[PDB]
Amino acid sequence: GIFGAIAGFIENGWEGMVDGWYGFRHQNSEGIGQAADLKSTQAAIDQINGKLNRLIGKTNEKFHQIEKEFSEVEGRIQDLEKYVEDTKIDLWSYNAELLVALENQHTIDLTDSEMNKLFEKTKKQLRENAEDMGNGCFKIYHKCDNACIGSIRNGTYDHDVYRDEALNNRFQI
Amino acid sequence: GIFGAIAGFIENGWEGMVDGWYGFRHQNSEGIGQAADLKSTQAAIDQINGKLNRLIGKTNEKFHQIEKEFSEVEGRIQDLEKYVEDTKIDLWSYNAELLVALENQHTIDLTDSEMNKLFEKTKKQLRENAEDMGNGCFKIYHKCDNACIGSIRNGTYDHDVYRDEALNNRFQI
Amino acid sequence: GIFGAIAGFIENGWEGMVDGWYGFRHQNSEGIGQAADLKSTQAAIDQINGKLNRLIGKTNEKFHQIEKEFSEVEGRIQDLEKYVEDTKIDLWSYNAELLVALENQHTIDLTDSEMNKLFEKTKKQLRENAEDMGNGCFKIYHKCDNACIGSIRNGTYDHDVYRDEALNNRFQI
Amino acid sequence: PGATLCLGHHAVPNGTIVKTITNDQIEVTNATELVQSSSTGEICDSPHQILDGENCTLIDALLGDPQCDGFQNKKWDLFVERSKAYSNCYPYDVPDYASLRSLVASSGTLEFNNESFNWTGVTQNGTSSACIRRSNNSFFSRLNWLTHLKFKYPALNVTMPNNEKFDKLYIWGVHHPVTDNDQIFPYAQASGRITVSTKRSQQTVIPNIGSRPRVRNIPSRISIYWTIVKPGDILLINSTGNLIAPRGYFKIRSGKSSIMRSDAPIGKCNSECITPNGSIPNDKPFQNVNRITYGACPRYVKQNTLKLATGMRNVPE
Amino acid sequence: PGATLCLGHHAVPNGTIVKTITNDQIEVTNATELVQSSSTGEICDSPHQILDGENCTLIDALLGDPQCDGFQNKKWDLFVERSKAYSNCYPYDVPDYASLRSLVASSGTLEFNNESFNWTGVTQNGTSSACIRRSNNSFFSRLNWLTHLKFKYPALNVTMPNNEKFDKLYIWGVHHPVTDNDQIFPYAQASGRITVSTKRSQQTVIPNIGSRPRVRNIPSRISIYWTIVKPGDILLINSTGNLIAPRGYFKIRSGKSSIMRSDAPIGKCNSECITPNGSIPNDKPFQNVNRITYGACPRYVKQNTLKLATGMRNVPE
Amino acid sequence: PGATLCLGHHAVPNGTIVKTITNDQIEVTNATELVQSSSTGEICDSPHQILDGENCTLIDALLGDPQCDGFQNKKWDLFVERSKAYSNCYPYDVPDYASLRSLVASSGTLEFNNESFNWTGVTQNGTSSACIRRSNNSFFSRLNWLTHLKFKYPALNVTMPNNEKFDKLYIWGVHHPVTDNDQIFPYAQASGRITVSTKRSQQTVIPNIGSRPRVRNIPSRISIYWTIVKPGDILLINSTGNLIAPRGYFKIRSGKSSIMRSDAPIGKCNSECITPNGSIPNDKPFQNVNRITYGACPRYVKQNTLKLATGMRNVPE
């Protein structure tokens, strides 16, 4: 939410993207395609696995403790035993509630961040050869076949190759 | 703070904006105006109400507990009763301090985010028809009357209508 | 991490920058230079000092408490004394672990934010006179001597002075 | 010519200072208080059933000090003990007073059922001038002071089974006589003793001949004990002298009842959260009124104020 | 003509609702449960050494009730006490039962070493019909019921030093006779007394003549006490009657042992975390199965479910 | 030609590894330690008033063991008890020793005021060879060992009212004689008894005739008890024998005083936080030196180190 991409300027997610979390759809002379971006996907996944590594399989051993159920009425000492345990449980219950709320807010934001970072990186790559349509899509002002699109996804696109073509298309009348 | 809009590239807030949290000021041929943006305003307000719903009116019932004041000197058992309560109170006091500090940092950042998102959305909407003056304002390079400004605020601005006019103004000498 | 500048689009840090945390390197007609940006540096440092002011030298006085080591086997009351203390220590140990993990995530993000804010501010300052090369560097499309570079770092660069020169260089063929 | 379009945000002339992770003082447009720090000063009589002890401690109401006769069989969610309370019957102590007070408080009722113990060999209904009931020497309503029959006193051996569905609570005691002036007068011998047992439990008590410091002009004492008898179990009282016998049992209940020391007046109002200072609202998550609470209460913390930002940073014009 | 290149993210047809700081219900692509809420219902016999008390409480196994003879000298990480347990030897109580039970539980062993106390002036090995061992009147295996020798009984004065490296635990007791029918039969006099001391400690106990409510048809009782004797110290037993003497000492150990009340069956399986409901997996950080646990366990919390988002916000098409 | 302007950030050749929410190992430019893990090993004598018990426990200093005479009337913020301490007066125990030790520790003073009790019918100032004071048989300075007057001993009945503004603490005791060799020598009869009462309280104690294991060659014992007397109340001592009487009262105070078991030497230095290992600095919020602390101390945690990032991520060149 906090970056504004997921559930923001990207209208919705793609159920048809099953091999990654983030990626690219394109339309060009040769058709309409989709490819996952593995680096952004793995960036998000690694961060979430970091949270899981802190929370899963990390338990504390406890052995002899205090009694926590009682069959006789006893007064003062039993009141204290009960109060200590009820106190403990409320503090842990609070820790667990807050932990999940904060981590979840953060997971939603970090995943939004990874979408935004990929968008930004792609924007800069395109230089003067494309414009941002406001919905996560770039209008590319030159012929850009499957190999050209591939070159953008792979970070090998040379913007100078297309710049004259693109400027001509962009600033026509 | 973290996005850089509120108390950053926006020099200051508007005391005269009383019908929203975020919005638009304009100068054009027909004068100088102000309109609130309800969507960004409501986005911020809903998030803060979400925090309030978690914290307000959510209390825990407790009944018979331990004694917490004592008129006689007793030693061991009283030391423990006092220590349990003092322990509890310090842990809750810590929870309350940290909660407010973190939530407040987050509220300040999320509100900064909402300002930034609206700015960004407006920038993309303008395409090649405006430039960012660095202080939250766009120089729009075409005649843009009250209805035109209205169209930008309402998300119905058609940038193609003005593009030739704007390019001519932008890239003159 | 969350903004994408430090360890993201900025490939690496500068060991040779010893008088600030953020800054500028340039190449122009008169050579290649480096200057620290004090405002962004101080912004980051002040936030980290704010965290330190909350955590350093803030201790709580405690006096007579409960016993925490025992030379005799006693049963019920000693079980409770031990359990109260072990309970307390685990709750504090949790607080300390979580505090450091969260603060550290936040420090890394706020420092990334300060880098991003300076980058963004510089981008807007340059208007139509430069392009973003995607790696934190701007290609400036006009002669920009040491004083000109100085003017950008000091926020006194007048983009109109160079605009005709820059547009000519940018949109040539 | 063109146009200019500026994005911005509101500000207020009267911002509020809050704390954050990075700054102990930052001004926001608005904030709300999370710590309840005030009470109206009265304990609201709703929605919890309040029992104002007035001049009576719970223990005095339990034993049946004459001035506490109006408390018989009453129930409470919260029993309120007043600092002006005082005892006005036979002087006594309760070893582990605090526990008896607690278990009765928590039980939340003074429901008492009389039982017919076979008391033969002794005179029942002993009275004293230090426990005036209706302008006549009397005793604790729930206790039966057992003395001789014709300068003679055989070894008592009375049994009472618990056929009920609940724990019975028996309150009983032992008289500690001043000298021989009340050793040979009410028991008719040099020595006495009390054993109160069950299938699971035994308590045996020795009387003590000796003058105490006079309390309301009496120098002898009574020591008060208790015995819980579970369903299917049986109370047994072997006594050879000095028995302060039960006239029956109190019902033990479980539920949400408690006791609180407070001098706040009871008011005709409705508040879920009670402290010794009075009831407090429970909208806020925290409170610094009192660590002692009853009901749906904010949690006690040490801070007097904690402001939650409910708006953006305030950046005036 | 050109091209269009769209950046996007995945979505799923079956998202999951989680809580966040700003929204109690937001759909994400995936989540994982942090609260363990189920048990298989058996206490796994591995990897902790489980000792199923079966019909025996720890205390009965300690004292040596005949049906508990199979427990002699056994050790445990976790002793499991069953709600069907019952005593079937001489009726008894233990003042501060809970502490004795606890310190033995924690010690984690019933290792007992017989010692030769010089018992002269008395008949040893007293037995009763309420403690049948191998179809013959008997007694607690670890106790030695000491009675007269030829209608005579002098003041016992036996000493035993602790030369070991560990705390010795001595269990001993006092007989409380029904009437004179077992006051003049096993001790040969009107009165008796027990003093069990060390260099650091003294416990003295008075026998009590009196009928109790019959438990398995016996109306006398035994009261059980204990004494820890540290290395270099010495146990002393002065007795003039009624002594229920130790036949030796239990080793006190320290370690991770405990006791748990549970009726769950023991299964042939391996689980680090035990609750009274059965073993539970310990992958999750929290659990709402039981506040009572033993081993490497998730922490008990009140919530039934806490979902941690493991994917982005789900924004369907 | 133009120019190039690059934005960047610093890096260092020696980064530090910290933990975050998403990564257990990330390198930052700088960090600071939040857990104090070292002590200098001395307890600083400032700014808290330290009282080094040396050879004396607090209890021995309280009772007035001759070697502790130098402790009379001293005060402390923190009393330090040494593992080399030993008793060298009459052997004794204190039922609930831990509570007496605690309430005196917390009171923070040994201020003692002598009172003139009317002791007639007995010889005062009993002494013994096991409590040598200034090369002469003696006794606990604060206790008055009361024995016969001319093979006779009537029932003592001394009163003492508390007209002060503070709780008085009376320490008193009972002698348990070895045999008849010190039953008919110091009291002149077969039997004795002690009742120490107030308006609110009564404690009665029976002496016990019997040999104990010899401690510094004495086989009799003294059992030590206490009684707090509030303003307006009165102490009463009925005794028929064996009384170890108070010579007066200790002042009870309230404040921040405590006691600590430690063998660390006392140094001439200034440190707010004391542990048994020595004083520690209190700049850091946490510490893993000791769970036992006194003063303004970091909070004890289990971790040995917690590094707070104080710079950005370190991304070397």
Ligand SMILES: *[C@@H]1O[C@H](CO)[C@@H](O[C@@H]2O[C@H](CO)[C@@H](O[C@@H]3O[C@H](CO[C@H]4O[C@H](CO)[C@@H](O)[C@H](O)[C@@H]4O)[C@@H](O)[C@H](O[C@H]4O[C@H](CO)[C@@H](O)[C@H](O)[C@@H]4O)[C@@H]3O)[C@H](O)[C@H]2NC(C)=O)[C@H](O)[C@H]1NC(C)=O
């Ligand atoms: C600064 O920030 C705070 C918090 O965001 C704002 O205060 C809130 O304002 C709203 C709207 O005025 C309040 O809503 C009202 O709550 C009343 C309940 O009163 C008590 O209980 C709440 C908890 O539920 C306590 O926190 C509070 O202290 C009160 O003691 C209702 O009775 C109101 O109902 C009335 O209006 C509605 C219309 O919306 C009708 O449907 C009803 O019939 C009735 O007439 C209402 O719901 C809310 O209580 C305030 N919260 C707090 C914490 O105080 C400030 O307004 C804001 N300041 C500025 C300048 O924006």
Ligand SMILES: *[C@@H]1O[C@H](CO)[C@@H](O[C@@H]2O[C@H](CO)[C@@H](O[C@@H]3O[C@H](CO[C@H]4O[C@H](CO)[C@@H](O)[C@H](O)[C@@H]4O)[C@@H](O)[C@H](O[C@H]4O[C@H](CO)[C@@H](O)[C@H](O)[C@@H]4O)[C@@H]3O)[C@H](O)[C@H]2NC(C)=O)[C@H](O)[C@H]1NC(C)=O
């Ligand atoms: C929704 O989100 C969750 C969490 O991100 C995903 O679930 C995880 O998926 C991975 C991969 O399938 C699981 O990894 C496997 O763990 C097994 C251990 O089983 C228990 O123990 C874990 C804790 O360690 C418990 O959390 C869990 O409940 C189990 O009871 C291993 O046995 C597996 O090993 C097998 O595969 C590997 C290959 O990677 C081989 O090397 C092995 O030999 C073996 O064949 C494996 O490591 C992980 O346990 C899951 N976590 C949780 C918390 O459930 C979901 O997949 C995800 N959903 C979607 C649609 O993406």
Ligand SMILES: *[C@@H]1O[C@H](CO)[C@@H](O[C@@H]2O[C@H](CO)[C@@H](O[C@@H]3O[C@H](CO[C@H]4O[C@H](CO)[C@@H](O)[C@H](O)[C@@H]4O)[C@@H](O)[C@H](O[C@H]4O[C@H](CO)[C@@H](O)[C@H](O)[C@@H]4O)[C@@H]3O)[C@H](O)[C@H]2NC(C)=O)[C@H](O)[C@H]1NC(C)=O
């Ligand atoms: C890595 O990160 C840390 C934390 O940001 C930096 O360390 C801090 O550096 C500052 C400046 O050097 C230190 O400030 C000094 O504090 C001294 C107090 O000493 C003790 O007390 C503090 C708590 O107050 C403890 O944390 C600390 O361990 C010490 O034991 C003062 O005595 C100093 O005063 C002197 O200088 C000032 C000028 O500023 C004069 O006014 C004085 O008269 C005097 O001469 C000074 O104020 C601070 O203590 C450090 N903090 C910590 C936690 O260690 C590292 O510098 C940084 N590393 C790099 C390479 O940047």
Ligand SMILES: *[C@@H]1O[C@H](CO)[C@@H](O[C@@H]2O[C@H](CO)[C@@H](O[C@@H]3O[C@H](CO)[C@@H](O)[C@H](O)[C@@H]3O)[C@H](O)[C@H]2NC(C)=O)[C@H](O)[C@H]1NC(C)=O
């Ligand atoms: C043991 O000592 C106490 C204290 O000296 C004796 O008790 C005291 O006895 C006197 C006379 O019997 C009491 O006097 C009475 O008290 C009221 C109240 O002030 C007074 O107005 C009357 O004159 C009345 O006679 C006195 O109160 C009482 N003092 C205390 C402190 O309790 C006690 O008698 C002695 N024991 C024996 C067996 O003699």
Ligand SMILES: *[C@@H]1O[C@H](CO)[C@@H](O[C@@H]2O[C@H](CO)[C@@H](O[C@@H]3O[C@H](CO)[C@@H](O)[C@H](O)[C@@H]3O)[C@H](O)[C@H]2NC(C)=O)[C@H](O)[C@H]1NC(C)=O
């Ligand atoms: C003190 O009072 C109790 C209760 O009245 C006496 O104990 C009771 O004594 C009778 C007869 O001696 C016991 O009878 C026996 O019990 C079994 C079990 O039901 C019964 O089947 C046989 O007929 C057998 O004789 C009875 O159980 C017992 N009751 C209780 C509740 O314990 C006791 O004897 C009295 N004390 C003295 C010294 O007389």
Ligand SMILES: *[C@@H]1O[C@H](CO)[C@@H](O[C@@H]2O[C@H](CO)[C@@H](O[C@@H]3O[C@H](CO)[C@@H](O)[C@H](O)[C@@H]3O)[C@H](O)[C@H]2NC(C)=O)[C@H](O)[C@H]1NC(C)=O
């Ligand atoms: C009850 O039994 C104990 C233990 O047998 C008797 O105490 C022991 O008595 C002897 C001789 O009276 C003590 O001897 C003395 O001890 C020192 C220290 O070693 C020794 O060097 C001398 O020779 C001196 O006479 C012995 O210490 C003592 N033992 C213990 C363990 O306390 C006690 O006398 C018996 N009770 C009665 C009433 O006889």
Ligand SMILES: *[C@@H]1O[C@H](CO[C@H]2O[C@@H](C)[C@@H](O)[C@@H](O)[C@@H]2O)[C@@H](O[C@@H]2O[C@H](CO)[C@@H](O)[C@H](O)[C@H]2NC(C)=O)[C@H](O)[C@H]1NC(C)=O
């Ligand atoms: C609760 O008790 C108060 C005061 O109690 C004192 O009353 C004295 C007469 C005497 O018994 C003394 O030992 C005790 O401490 C009661 O108030 C008193 O009521 C009486 C009789 O109605 C009046 O004669 C007094 O004027 C009055 N005294 C004071 C100081 O107010 C009060 O009635 C009683 N409350 C209840 C509910 O029973």
Ligand SMILES: *[C@@H]1O[C@H](CO[C@H]2O[C@@H](C)[C@@H](O)[C@@H](O)[C@@H]2O)[C@@H](O[C@@H]2O[C@H](CO)[C@@H](O)[C@H](O)[C@H]2NC(C)=O)[C@H](O)[C@H]1NC(C)=O
């Ligand atoms: C604290 O006590 C120590 C040692 O205590 C031993 O002293 C023996 C002589 C004997 O009493 C034994 O029971 C006891 O355990 C004192 O040190 C001793 O001081 C004496 C007299 O000055 C010397 O003769 C010894 O050499 C010396 N012994 C040792 C082992 O050091 C010490 O003086 C005393 N401290 C204070 C402050 O009183």
Ligand SMILES: *[C@@H]1O[C@H](CO)[C@@H](O[C@@H]2O[C@H](CO)[C@@H](O)[C@H](O)[C@H]2NC(C)=O)[C@H](O)[C@H]1NC(C)=O
């Ligand atoms: C509510 O009453 C409590 C308890 O009486 C008050 O706290 C005490 O205040 C007095 C006088 O200021 C101090 O002497 C005590 O030390 C305080 N006790 C504790 C435990 O803090 C409290 O001030 C009252 N609060 C309100 C809002 O009335």
Ligand SMILES: *[C@@H]1O[C@H](CO)[C@@H](O[C@@H]2O[C@H](CO)[C@@H](O)[C@H](O)[C@H]2NC(C)=O)[C@H](O)[C@H]1NC(C)=O
């Ligand atoms: C495990 O057993 C515990 C304890 O018996 C169960 O909690 C009790 O459930 C019963 C019946 O629902 C209630 O009457 C008790 O009040 C509960 N006690 C407590 C302390 O909560 C629990 O339901 C069982 N859990 C599972 C997963 O089997």
Ligand SMILES: *[C@@H]1O[C@H](CO)[C@@H](O[C@@H]2O[C@H](CO)[C@@H](O)[C@H](O)[C@H]2NC(C)=O)[C@H](O)[C@H]1NC(C)=O
């Ligand atoms: C300070 O002393 C404490 C207590 O003596 C030390 O902790 C003990 O260390 C010993 C030896 O390593 C262990 O046998 C104990 O189990 C430890 N006890 C506890 C409670 O942890 C501690 O190591 C010392 N710390 C420093 C910094 O000197």
Ligand SMILES: CC(=O)N[C@H]1[C@H]([C@H](O)[C@H](O)CO)O[C@@](O)(C(=O)O)C[C@@H]1O
């Ligand atoms: C049941 C009984 O015997 N009651 C009598 C008591 C007791 O003898 C003493 O209170 C015990 O010490 O003494 C009185 O003087 C009294 O207090 O009024 C007369 C009263 O008839």
Ligand SMILES: CC(=O)N[C@H]1[C@H]([C@H](O)[C@H](O)CO)O[C@@](O)(C(=O)O)C[C@@H]1O
């Ligand atoms: C050691 C001893 O004396 N044992 C005898 C006991 C005791 O006298 C009473 O149990 C004590 O009250 O009584 C019996 O009737 C019995 O229980 O079998 C006979 C048995 O020989």
Ligand SMILES: CC(=O)N[C@H]1[C@H]([C@H](O)[C@H](O)CO)O[C@@](O)(C(=O)O)C[C@@H]1O
């Ligand atoms: C007050 C008194 O009577 N003191 C005497 C004591 C006691 O009789 C016993 O210590 C009590 O058991 O015994 C001595 O041998 C001793 O210890 O020096 C002689 C001393 O005069």
Ligand SMILES: *[C@@H]1O[C@H](CO)[C@@H](O)[C@H](O)[C@H]1NC(C)=O
């Ligand atoms: C981009 O990378 C992929 C890796 O699978 C490769 O198959 C593809 O040919 C690359 N595209 C171009 C245009 O080089």
Ligand SMILES: *[C@@H]1O[C@H](CO)[C@@H](O)[C@H](O)[C@H]1NC(C)=O
């Ligand atoms: C924009 O929306 C508002 C809604 O109040 C409407 O009144 C206005 O006419 C719209 N502006 C234009 C230019 O359509």
